[PDB]
């Protein structure tokens, strides 16, 4: 909630969406947020950051992706 | 008359503005927009900035090589093979970005509305 961070997600259609995520959110939770906003079922979603796959069970922080509030990662669906 | 023009446009109340082109003036104060990344949707006229290219010293958000968006300032542009590149400075350093890598936050785009808003 209060300490959430902005991320971007590029979908297969070329649309980029934003999400607010907790440093602690799991990848599954990120996929649920993408479903909730954009309608893509989690079973279709495979997320990557900078060419590396994001595993179910990890947070973005488990990948050292979230920085300060100045820099916002772009995740990509593949 | 706006058909065919390059613009930067958002599709949500608090969203970011993305580069694209108007392909049609449609009903109810909306315009069909083809975004440069291939997304097409109808957008409200109030959410369109008719600025092409984004002017010097505009504060923008740009996608760096490391796959982070962050703020920068436009310092130049280059047209090569029909494509536009922006020179944007971040933390004192300039790099070149494709047009489609340069977006505007709500605040950044609101700064441009008085001069470049449609309508």
Author numbering:
A (entry chain B): -3 to 74
B (entry chain A): 1485 to 1603
Give verbatim excerpts from the published study on this entry.
An alternative way to improve HDR editing rates is through downregulation or inhibition of key factors involved in competing NHEJ and MMEJ pathways, such as 53BP1 and DNAPKcs (NHEJ) or DNA polymerase theta (MMEJ). In this study, we leverage this functional screening system to assess focused libraries targeting the protein-protein interface of i53, an engineered ubiquitin derivative, and its binding target, 53BP1. Using targeted saturation mutagenesis at the i53:53BP1 binding interface and a screening process in primary human HSPCs (a cell type with intact DNA repair, DNA damage sensing responses and other cell stress sensing signaling pathways), we identified i53 variants that introduce stabilizing interactions with 53BP1 and are more potent than i53 at increasing HDR editing outcomes in HSPCs. Using these classifications, we determined that the addition of i53 variants results in an increase of HDR by specifically reducing NHEJ events but not MMEJ nor other types of outcomes, consistent to their role as 53BP1 antagonists.
We first screened individual and combinatorial saturation mutagenesis libraries targeting two adjacent i53 residues L67 and H68, located at the binding interface of i53 and 53BP1, and identified amino acid variants that were enriched in the GFP+ population relative to i53, in particular variants that introduce a positive charge at residue 67. Of the 19 new variants tested, one (L67R) was found to be significantly enriched relative to parent i53 (L67), although L67H was borderline significant and was also moved on to subsequent validation. We observed that the L67R change enables a new 2.8 Å H-bond with D1550 of 53BP1, and that L67H forms a network of inter- and intramolecular H-bonds, including a water mediated H-bond to S1554 of 53BP1 and an H-bond to D64 on i53. All recombinant variants complexed with the 53BP1 Tudor domain and exhibited increased binding affinity relative to parental i53, suggesting a correlation between the improved affinity of the selected variants and their enrichment in the GFP+ population in our screening platform. Next, we quantified the potency improvement by testing a range of concentrations for editing HSPC cells and found the variants induce a ~ 3-fold improvement in potency compared to parental i53 protein. Comparing the use of AZD7648 with the i53 variant L67R across different loci, we found that DNAPKi and L67R have locus-dependent effects on HDR outcomes, suggesting that DNAPKcs- and 53BP1- mediated NHEJ pathways are utilized differently depending on the target genomic sequence. Indeed, we found that combining both inhibitors resulted in an improvement of HDR larger than that of L67R or AZD7648 alone.
